[PDB]
Enzyme design. Structure first.
Site, PDB file in Angstrom:
ATOM      1  N   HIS A 249       0.773  -1.140  -0.004  1.00  0.00           N
ATOM      2  CA  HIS A 249       0.042  -0.195   0.205  1.00  0.00           C
ATOM      3  C   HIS A 249       0.987   1.359   0.114  1.00  0.00           C
ATOM      4  CE1 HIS A 249      -3.182   2.917   1.061  1.00  0.00           C
ATOM      5  NE2 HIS A 249      -2.600   2.901   2.273  1.00  0.00           N
TER       6      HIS A 249
ATOM      7  N   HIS B 243      -9.574   2.253   8.875  1.00  0.00           N
ATOM      8  CA  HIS B 243      -9.198   1.603   9.931  1.00  0.00           C
ATOM      9  C   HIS B 243      -8.118   2.122  10.997  1.00  0.00           C
ATOM     10  CE1 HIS B 243      -4.945   0.756   8.373  1.00  0.00           C
ATOM     11  NE2 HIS B 243      -5.527   0.949   7.266  1.00  0.00           N
ATOM     12  N   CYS B 244      -8.040   1.845  12.101  1.00  0.00           N
ATOM     13  CA  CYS B 244      -7.087   1.856  12.968  1.00  0.00           C
ATOM     14  C   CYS B 244      -5.794   1.457  12.580  1.00  0.00           C
ATOM     15  CB  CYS B 244      -7.043   1.227  14.318  1.00  0.00           C
ATOM     16  SG  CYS B 244      -5.977   1.965  15.651  1.00  0.00           S
ATOM     17  N   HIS B 245      -4.642   2.487  12.411  1.00  0.00           N
ATOM     18  CA  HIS B 245      -3.242   2.158  11.885  1.00  0.00           C
ATOM     19  C   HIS B 245      -2.387   1.558  12.943  1.00  0.00           C
ATOM     20  CE1 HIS B 245      -0.337   1.966   8.853  1.00  0.00           C
ATOM     21  NE2 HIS B 245      -1.177   2.919   7.894  1.00  0.00           N
ATOM     22  N   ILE B 246      -2.825   1.050  14.165  1.00  0.00           N
ATOM     23  CA  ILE B 246      -1.933   0.177  15.008  1.00  0.00           C
ATOM     24  C   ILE B 246      -2.441  -1.298  14.344  1.00  0.00           C
ATOM     25  CG2 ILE B 246      -2.031  -0.768  17.279  1.00  0.00           C
ATOM     26  CD1 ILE B 246      -2.956   2.032  18.556  1.00  0.00           C
TER      27      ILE B 246
ATOM     28  N   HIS C  37      -5.906   5.684  19.406  1.00  0.00           N
ATOM     29  CA  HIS C  37      -6.137   5.002  18.200  1.00  0.00           C
ATOM     30  C   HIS C  37      -6.130   5.670  17.192  1.00  0.00           C
ATOM     31  CE1 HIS C  37      -7.565   1.209  20.187  1.00  0.00           C
ATOM     32  NE2 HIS C  37      -8.270   2.048  20.921  1.00  0.00           N
TER      33      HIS C  37
ATOM     34  N   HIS D 250       4.131   0.386   2.407  1.00  0.00           N
ATOM     35  CA  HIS D 250       4.143  -0.729   3.549  1.00  0.00           C
ATOM     36  C   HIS D 250       3.245  -2.159   3.154  1.00  0.00           C
ATOM     37  CE1 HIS D 250       0.046   0.168   5.612  1.00  0.00           C
ATOM     38  NE2 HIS D 250       0.480   1.657   5.458  1.00  0.00           N
TER      39      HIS D 250
ATOM     40  N   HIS E 236      -7.092   6.168  10.155  1.00  0.00           N
ATOM     41  CA  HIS E 236      -6.704   6.318   8.725  1.00  0.00           C
ATOM     42  C   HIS E 236      -7.770   5.924   7.613  1.00  0.00           C
ATOM     43  CE1 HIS E 236      -4.262   6.558   5.173  1.00  0.00           C
ATOM     44  NE2 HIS E 236      -4.319   5.461   4.943  1.00  0.00           N
TER      45      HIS E 236
ATOM     46  N   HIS F 149       0.950   4.532   1.144  1.00  0.00           N
ATOM     47  CA  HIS F 149       0.156   5.177   2.147  1.00  0.00           C
ATOM     48  C   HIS F 149      -0.208   6.767   1.779  1.00  0.00           C
ATOM     49  CE1 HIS F 149      -1.534   5.705   6.514  1.00  0.00           C
ATOM     50  NE2 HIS F 149      -1.153   7.002   5.852  1.00  0.00           N
TER      51      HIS F 149
ATOM     52  N   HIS G 296      -4.323  -3.913  16.000  1.00  0.00           N
ATOM     53  CA  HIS G 296      -5.619  -3.822  16.250  1.00  0.00           C
ATOM     54  C   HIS G 296      -6.365  -3.905  14.888  1.00  0.00           C
ATOM     55  CE1 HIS G 296      -4.646  -0.507  19.716  1.00  0.00           C
ATOM     56  NE2 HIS G 296      -4.276  -1.935  19.736  1.00  0.00           N
TER      57      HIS G 296
ATOM     58  N   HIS H 289       0.347  -4.413   3.287  1.00  0.00           N
ATOM     59  CA  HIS H 289      -1.167  -4.333   3.781  1.00  0.00           C
ATOM     60  C   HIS H 289      -1.378  -5.737   3.877  1.00  0.00           C
ATOM     61  CE1 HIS H 289      -4.378  -2.381   5.248  1.00  0.00           C
ATOM     62  NE2 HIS H 289      -4.004  -1.099   4.717  1.00  0.00           N
TER      63      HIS H 289
ATOM     64  N   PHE I 176     -10.438  -3.866  13.618  1.00  0.00           N
ATOM     65  CA  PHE I 176     -10.659  -2.452  13.978  1.00  0.00           C
ATOM     66  C   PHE I 176     -10.697  -1.876  12.401  1.00  0.00           C
ATOM     67  CE2 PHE I 176     -10.247   0.843  17.353  1.00  0.00           C
ATOM     68  CZ  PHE I 176     -11.729   1.116  17.536  1.00  0.00           C
TER      69      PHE I 176
ATOM     70  N   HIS J  73      -8.155   5.387   3.660  1.00  0.00           N
ATOM     71  CA  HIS J  73      -7.561   5.396   2.180  1.00  0.00           C
ATOM     72  C   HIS J  73      -8.185   6.312   1.147  1.00  0.00           C
ATOM     73  CE1 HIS J  73      -5.423   1.042   2.449  1.00  0.00           C
ATOM     74  NE2 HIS J  73      -5.538   1.430   3.898  1.00  0.00           N
TER      75      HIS J  73
HETATM   76 CU   LIG Z   1      -5.997   1.164  17.513  1.00  0.00          CU
HETATM   77 CU   LIG Z   2      -0.531   3.326   5.941  1.00  0.00          CU
HETATM   78 CU   LIG Z   3      -3.587   4.276   3.523  1.00  0.00          CU
HETATM   79 CU   LIG Z   4      -5.038   0.572   5.341  1.00  0.00          CU
END
Ligand SMILES: [Cu+2]
Ligand SMILES: [Cu+2]
Ligand SMILES: [Cu+2]
Ligand SMILES: [Cu+2]
Ligand SMILES: *[C@@H]1O[C@H](CO)[C@@H](O[C@@H]2O[C@H](CO)[C@@H](O)[C@H](O)[C@H]2NC(C)=O)[C@H](O)[C@H]1NC(C)=O
Ligand SMILES: *[C@@H]1O[C@H](CO)[C@@H](O[C@@H]2O[C@H](CO)[C@@H](O)[C@H](O)[C@H]2NC(C)=O)[C@H](O)[C@H]1NC(C)=O
Length: 497
Positions: A65, A452-455, A397, A110, A400, A67, A458, A112, A463, A402
C-alpha cells in the site's frame, strides 16, 4: 539513492540486527527501512514488486500500500489485501502503475497483508514539488533529511502469542536504535547538518503501534507539512506523532557546532533514554565524533497541539458549520471486547474475494458485499462526516482513511469543533475517553476505501470497515489491467481456495 518513479522493488527474507539482536525479516530493497521511492507531483509511478519471499513464518504472500496516495481511477493498485487485491504469491511480480496528480508531500509504503509490515516491509515515499510554496523556507531537502521512526520486535509478528500483551523491543530512528532490555551499545543513527543551513526534515512514522514524543535537544521545529498537506508555519519543541503520520519541519542549524540528542519516546515499551535507547544523534559538521551530552527539558515549552495547525492553502471545510452538517453524517460505534475490535458491532475479517472484485463482478449494494456489515456504501459527490468517538481499549487509536485526506473538524482532547480552518490530513488520533474526533471529506473518488486503526495489531484484531464509495461508478472509474485480474486466480490456486 532514492528509486522511482519507475522501478523494480524486490521483497525478500533476510536477517537484520538493527538494535544488535539478529532476527529474520521481510524487506523491500534489502534494507530496513526500505529504500525511499520518490518522484515529482503528477508523475506516473510504476513500481514492479517482485515477491521473492520463502519464509512462511512471516508469510510468503505480500501486498503493498502506497500510504496517503489517493489512487483515483486506480483503486486496483491501492494495496490492502482482500479490499483491493488478492496478495501477490511468491515467485510472481506485479506492477503497481498509478499517477499522483494534485499531491506532493511526504508519504510511505508498507505491506498491507496481515501484520507483515511489522516484520520489516516499510519505507518512505516522497512526492516532491518543483514549485513547492515552502521552498524558500529551507536549503536542503533530500534523502538525508528523511527521518523514520519505527517500532521493532524481537518476536515475529505472526508468532505473537494470543492473550499476551504486545510491546516492542526497540525504537529505531533511521533504522538504528537500542534494545529496551539487555541493552547493547549498538550503533545509533546520525543525522548531519551544516551550521547556518536550514533543512526540510521529513519526519515519518512507520510505526506498527506506538506514538512517539519526538524532539531534538537545543532545537525547535517549524512544521510546514502534515500528512501531505502544506501547513502554515508552526514552531514547536516537541511533536507527538502517531502511527502512519508524517510532518515536515524546518530545522535551522542555528546552535553551536556540536552533538545533540534526537529523542523519540514511545507511549509503550522502554521509558526514558538509559543506555541510549529511544535516541539518535544530530551532528554538526566539524563536531567531535562523540555522543551528545545534552538533556531534555523537564517540561517542553511548545508541544504540537493539532488544533494549532492550519492549511497553507485556503482549504476550508466542506458542508455546514455544525455537527451533522453534511450530506451523509455518520457516527461510528468503535468498540473492543474479548480480544476483538468492532465497528458498529462488526469485527473486520478479510473476505475471500476482494471487495473491489466483488463489485466488479456485479454486486451493487453494500449489503450484497462481504464481509456482511463491514462494507458501508457512500454516495457520490457528497459531503461525508464521520465522528469517531473514543473509549475502546488500547487507545489512543490513529484512524486512517484510504483514497482521501480529510478535514479534522474536531481533534483529541478538545471538545470544540473547527468548521473554519482545521488541518487536513490522512491519519488522526481519535484521543481519549469522551472525545469526539470528527472528520469530513467529499466523495469524488469511486472505489472501496479502507478505514481503520493504524495500530497494525488492532487492524488484525478487526478494527476496520470498508467505505464502498460510489459503487455504481467503481467499474467504469477503475479499469483493471490483466495482471490484476490474474492475482486472485493465482492466489486461490496456490492456497487451494
Ligand atoms: Cu487502535
Ligand atoms: Cu499506511
Ligand atoms: Cu493508506
Ligand atoms: Cu490501510
Ligand atoms: C459525537 O458527535 C456526533 C455528531 O457528529 C453525535 O451524534 C449524535 O448522537 C446522538 C446520540 O448520542 C443522536 O441523538 C444524534 O442523532 C447524533 N447526531 C447529531 C446531533 O448530529 C455523538 O453523540 C457525539 N458523541 C460523543 C461521545 O460526544
Ligand atoms: C480547542 O479547539 C478550538 C477549535 O479548533 C480552538 O479554538 C480556536 O482557537 C483559535 C486560537 O485561539 C482561535 O483563533 C479560533 O477562533 C478558535 N476557533 C474556535 C471554533 O473556537 C482552541 O484554541 C483549542 N484549545 C486549545 C487549548 O488549544
Amino acid at each position: 539513492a532514492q528509486i522511482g518513479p519507475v522501478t523494480d522493488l524486490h521483497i525478500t527474507n533476510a536477517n537484520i540486527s538493527p538494535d544488535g539482536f539478529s532476527r529474520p525479516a521481510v524487506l523491500a530493497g534489502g534494507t530496513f527501512p526500505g529504500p525511499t521511492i520518490a518522484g515529482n507531483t503528477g508523475d506516473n509511478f510504476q513500481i514492479t514488486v517482485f515477491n521473492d519471499l520463502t519464509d512462511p513464518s512471516m508469510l510468503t504472500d505480500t501486498s503493498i500500500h502506497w500510504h496517503g496516495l489517493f489512487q483515483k481511477g486506480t483503486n486496483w493498485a491501492d494495496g490492502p489485501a482482500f479490499v483491493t487485491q488478492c496478495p501477490i504469491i511468491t515467485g510472481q511480480s506485479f506492477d503497481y502503475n498509478f499517477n499522483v496528480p494534485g499531491q506532493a508531500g511526504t508519504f510511505w509504503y508498507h505491506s498491507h497483508l496481515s501484520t507483515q509490515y511489522c516484520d520489516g516491509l516499510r519505507g518512505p515515499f516522497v512526492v516532491y514539488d518543483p514549485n513547492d510554496p515552502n521552498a524558500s523556507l529551507y536549503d536542503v531537502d533530500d534523502d538525508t533529511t528523511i527521518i523514520t521512526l519505527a517500532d521493532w520486535y524481537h518476536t515475529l509478528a505472526q508468532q505473537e502469542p494470543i492473550g499476551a500483551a504486545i510491546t516492542a523491543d526497540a525504537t529505531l530512528i533511521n533504522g538504528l536504535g537500542r534494545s529496551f532490555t539487555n541493552t547493547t551499545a549498538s550503533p545509533l543513527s546520525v543525522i548531519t547538518v551544516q551550521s547556518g543551513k536550514r533543512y526540510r526534515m521529513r519526519l515519518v512514522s512507520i510505526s506498527c503501534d506506538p506514538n512517539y514524543l519526538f524532539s531534538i535537544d537545543g532545537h525547535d521545529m517549524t512544521i510546514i507539512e502534515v500528512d501531505g498537506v502544506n501547513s502554515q508555519q508552526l514552531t514547536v519543541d516537541q511533536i507527538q506523532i502517531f502511527a502512519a503520520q508524517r510532518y515536515s519541519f524546518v530545522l535551522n542549524a542555528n546552535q553551536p557546532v556540536g552533538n545533540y540528542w534526537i529523542r523519540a519516546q514511545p507511549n509503550s515499551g522502554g521509558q526514558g533514554f538509559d543506555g541510549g535507547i529511544n535516541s539518535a544523534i544530530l551532528r554538526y559538521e566539524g563536531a567531535t565524533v562523540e555522543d551528545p551530552t545534552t538533556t531534555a527539558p523537564t517540561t517542553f515549552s511548545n508541544p504540537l497541539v493539532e488544533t494549532d495547525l492550519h492549511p497553507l492553502a485556503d482549504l476550508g471545510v466542506p458542508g455546514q458549520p455544525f455537527r451533522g452538517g453534511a450530506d451523509d453524517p455518520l457516527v461510528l460505534n468503535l468498540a473492543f471486547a474479548n480480544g476483538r475490535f468492532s465497528i458498529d458491532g462488526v469485527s473486520f475479517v478479510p473476505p475471500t474475494v476482494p471487495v473491489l472484485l466483488q463489485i466488479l463482478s456485479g454486486a451493487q449494494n453494500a449489503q450484497d458485499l462481504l464481509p456482511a456489515g463491514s462494507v458501508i456504501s457512500l454516495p457520490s459527490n457528497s459531503v461525508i462526516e464521520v465522528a469517531l468517538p473514543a473509549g475502546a481499549a488500547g487507545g489512543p487509536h490513529p484512524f486512517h482513511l484510504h483514497g482521501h485526506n480529510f478535514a479534522v473538524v474536531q481533534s483529541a482532547n478538545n471538545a470544540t469543533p473547527n468548521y473554519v480552518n482545521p488541518i487536513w490530513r490522512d491519519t488522526v488520533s481519535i484521543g481519549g475517553t469522551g472525545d469526539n474526533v470528527t472528520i469530513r471529506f467529499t466523495t469524488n473518488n469511486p472505489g472501496p476505501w479502507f478505514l481503520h486503526c493504524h495500530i497494525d495489531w488492532h487492524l488484525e484484531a478487526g478494527f476496520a470497515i470498508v467505505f464502498a464509495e460510489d459503487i455504481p461508478d467503481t467499474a467504469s472509474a477503475n479499469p483493471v489491467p490483466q495482471a490484476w485480474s490474474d492475482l486472485c486466480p493465482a492466489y486461490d490456486q496456490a492456497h487451494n481456495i
